[PDB]
């Protein structure tokens, strides 16, 4: 079982109260959505997900609360149109809970293809066939050139060995099609000496497969999570009430940066991890930020309790960024 990550913080943060309408742009399993419909019995809630399996769960769970929860299906970009059909263009949503990442059910079910450990079709697509033409991870690896595929790994996977892990994929695909998760994992391992398979470690300091950065990289290029995250936040702002509390959850750095640089106005094209020294050097050259539209409830990113991390290691990297619209 997967407990909703930081459910206690997200509930306190949004303080759901009677007379307030809320949105959920990532229903998924619905653990967070259900934790929010428990504290306040008079709450109004809206749900959304990219997975039709997740949208069916919400529809089945809608029986528990007939109108307090309203289920919707679609991507972040398509969310505004879907909600615009309802007619809530101003929205006046008190809070938008934009949980991020892959659902526990999505990656616990081997058929969905998200787990390298198990053997499933190399789908790695949050979409559940709602768009049967949407390329899957298998398609991405078999088509793109080394330079193109290396960029996917480098930019989205934070993978130093992008050229080494991409060349192995290019050679492997020629010999046979890459259609299964384990088939890819073995190819990526084959780019390195056999001992490399578990040399790398996580921040938890527990050995991880040497292809855990290629499964994350493709997952984010197949589902365009990063570009869809920028529109998703923007749409929330337009549909978010003034004085309404937004709450995001970033499990990896790339998504965390966008949430940080969006709630603070920082340009998305600035250099990453800028030090104070570099900031001085940057502006010294020019010598020769706009008003913020948010009020961060908690100034610094929250993180899961160390005890809770061991119980749910999947959510160890959950960085909660809360803000109030201005």
């Amino acid at each position: 079982l997967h407990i909703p990550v930081m459910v206690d913080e997200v509930v306190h943060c949004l303080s759901p109260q009677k007379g307030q309408i809320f949105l959920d742009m990532t229903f998924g399993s619905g653990g967070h959505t259900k934790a929010i419909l428990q504290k306040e019995s008079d709450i109004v809630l809206y749900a959304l997900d990219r997975d039709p399996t997740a949208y069916a769960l919400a529809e089945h769970l809608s029986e528990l609360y007939p109108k307090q929860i309203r289920a919707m299906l679609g991507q972040f970009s398509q969310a505004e149109a879907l909600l615009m059909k309802a007619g809530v263009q101003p929205g006046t949503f008190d809070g938008v809970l934009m949980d991020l990442g892959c659902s526990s059910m999505q990656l616990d079910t081997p058929e969905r293809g998200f787990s390298l450990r198990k053997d499933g079709p190399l789908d790695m697509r949050m979409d559940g066939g709602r768009y049967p033409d949407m390329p899957t991870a298998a398609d991405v690896v078999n088509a793109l050139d080394q330079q193109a595929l290396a960029s996917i790994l480098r930019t989205y996977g934070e993978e130093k060995h992008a050229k080494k892990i991409a060349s192995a994929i290019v050679q492997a695909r020629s010999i046979y099609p890459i259609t299964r998760t384990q088939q890819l994992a073995s190819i990526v391992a084959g780019a390195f000496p056999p001992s490399a398979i578990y040399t790398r470690k996580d921040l938890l300091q527990r050995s991880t497969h040497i292809a855990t950065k290629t499964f994350q990289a493709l997952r984010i290029f197949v589902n365009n999570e990063l570009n869809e995250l920028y529109t998703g936040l923007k749409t929330a702002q337009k549909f978010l009430r003034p004085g309404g509390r937004l709450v995001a959850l970033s499990f990896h750095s790339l998504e965390d940066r966008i949430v940080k640089r969006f709630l603070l106005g920082i340009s998305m094209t600035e250099r990453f991890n800028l030090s104070v020294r570099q900031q001085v050097m940057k502006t010294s050259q020019l010598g020769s930020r706009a008003p913020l539209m948010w009020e961060l409830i908690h100034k610094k990113v929250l993180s899961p309790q160390d005890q809770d991390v061991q119980d749910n290691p999947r959510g160890r990297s959950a960085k909660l960024r809360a803000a109030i619209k201005l």
Partner: protein, 205 residues
Amino acid sequence: SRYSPEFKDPLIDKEYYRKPVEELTEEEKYVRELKKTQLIKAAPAGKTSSVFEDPVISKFTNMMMIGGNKVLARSLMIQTLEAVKRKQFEKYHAASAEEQATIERNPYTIFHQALKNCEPMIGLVPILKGGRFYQVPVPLPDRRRRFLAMKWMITECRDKKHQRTLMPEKLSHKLLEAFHNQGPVIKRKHDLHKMAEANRALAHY
């Protein structure tokens, strides 16, 4: 060029040659004795000594010329000058004796003043800074201001907004608008100036 660097451009000016010798300075006397030893390029077909020669209108005609069709370009020019003159003779006969004094009927005076009202004093340059583009204001040389006035006027008349209107009617209408400090081309001048004022703090780049 088929002219060697030794070839000098011809000076087509009747007055310059009839000027008496006594009025000449010792510097101007040297220039005249020097040119007698220099090679001179053949006069181009464009410019002559005619009293009706106008270098500004000849330049505007070339900026309107498409594919070397000078006959058509010049036809449009003279049709515009005739259309401007007829519009002013119509405004003149319909006016009172007092207003008639303020009505200009010379199309060359209107053409020149119409362009001078469109010349932008200051312009902007698209500059790159830190992977980001920001425009920078800069003074404009005299050549550039005159060229931009003629390019904005010709561009406006070629705009697709005008539906089935012939060029001599479009250009004549725009020239008379600019002659009165009104029109789209005058707005383009004002917008460029107003933008060059909002980027004054970027003048140090």
